């Protein structure tokens, strides 16, 4: 699928409260912290004798991940998130469809 | 596996009538519906929005809500050993006024007219419908209508 890098949409930024211009990017998770409470608990539980104390998922079935777009307002820099359907190939660049031409080579 | 989609088994139910395809006539959109009206549900296959589920095909209900291009209808549905109230949001293309009670209104009007007509002089106006009664006696004349004798006919092949 092809999605433009710019889109006009509602901005609930307490100063816009209306449709504004937004920059479009792709969401990325980010590194997990070593001092999150869930991480601190896991390290304590895993220490000592007893082996692995939590399940480890193996039976993967999905072949795709949902794409999330991060929309940043150009005026107030307020971010928003949108989720698209599952797809195998995703791009943000241009190269729009040509209406009709001869198939080269 | 089995298939139980929303429009399952509706191959013939939602089809248009023969030589009756195309756009809907304007009289469908000009009728007015009010809360308390009695309507019956018949889906139109050419209008995919606001279409009822196949269960409510051929059912009759009472309007409870009026919106821009649709009405709200109440249907009593039998589930298990009881009846549950169902509320439907249907566009006007799929409904029409029911005549199961419009014919009843004129009987109320005629009862009042007959009651007032006999009020000044008559008693026992008898404003109750009665079932068909056994025929009374009559005399059948044979003048020009002498009975014709009939007999069973023999078996013939005539193939």
């Amino acid at each position: 699928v092809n999605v433009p890098k710019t889109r006009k949409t509602y901005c609930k930024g307490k100063t816009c409260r209306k449709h504004t211009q937004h920059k479009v990017t792709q969401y990325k998770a980010g590194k997990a912290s070593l001092f999150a409470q869930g991480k601190r608990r896991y390290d304590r539980k895993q220490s000592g004798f007893g082996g692995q104390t939590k399940p480890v998922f193996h039976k993967k079935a999905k072949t795709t991940k949902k794409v999330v777009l991060r929309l940043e307002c150009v005026k107030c820099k307020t971010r928003a998130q949108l989720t698209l359907k599952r797809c195998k190939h995703f791009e943000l660049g241009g190269e729009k469809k040509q209406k009709g031409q001869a198939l080269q080579f | 596996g089995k298939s139980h989609g929303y429009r399952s088994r509706t191959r013939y139910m939602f089809q248009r009538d023969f030589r009756k395809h195309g756009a809907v006539h304007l009289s469908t959109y000009l009728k007015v519906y009010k809360v308390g009206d009695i309507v019956d549900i018949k889906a139109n296959g050419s209008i995919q929005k606001g279409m009822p589920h196949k269960f409510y095909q051929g059912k009759t209900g009472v309007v409870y809500n009026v919106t821009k291009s649709s009405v709200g209808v109440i249907i009593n549905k039998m589930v298990g050993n009881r009846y549950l109230e169902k509320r439907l949001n249907l566009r006007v293309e799929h409904i029409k006024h029911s005549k199961c009670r419009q014919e009843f209104l004129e009987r109320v009007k005629a009862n009042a007219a007959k009651r007032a007509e006999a009020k000044a002089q008559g008693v026992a106006v008898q404003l109750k419908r009665q079932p068909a009664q056994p025929r009374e006696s009559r005399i059948v004349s044979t003048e020009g209508n002498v009975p014709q004798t009939l007999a069973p006919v023999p078996y013939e092949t005539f193939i």
Binding site: - | N65, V66, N81, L84
Partner: protein, 56 residues
């Protein structure tokens, strides 16, 4: 070992022991799902006619 899959035998007889109850009808039914704009004005209309009868 294979067993039976499905049947509706005896189900109607069970439903008729105490069932088939027509729904109870009430005056003043619930206004759930009614158009919010109509209900906003209907509330104001009822307050106005309450004052008139009380002050009559």
């Amino acid at each position: 070992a294979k067993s039976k899959n499905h049947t509706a035998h005896n189900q109607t007889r069970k439903a008729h022991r105490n069932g088939i109850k027509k729904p109870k009808t009430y005056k003043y039914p619930s206004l759930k799902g009614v158009d919010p704009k109509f209900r906003r004005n209907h509330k104001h209309a009822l307050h106005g006619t309450a004052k008139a009868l009380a002050a009559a």
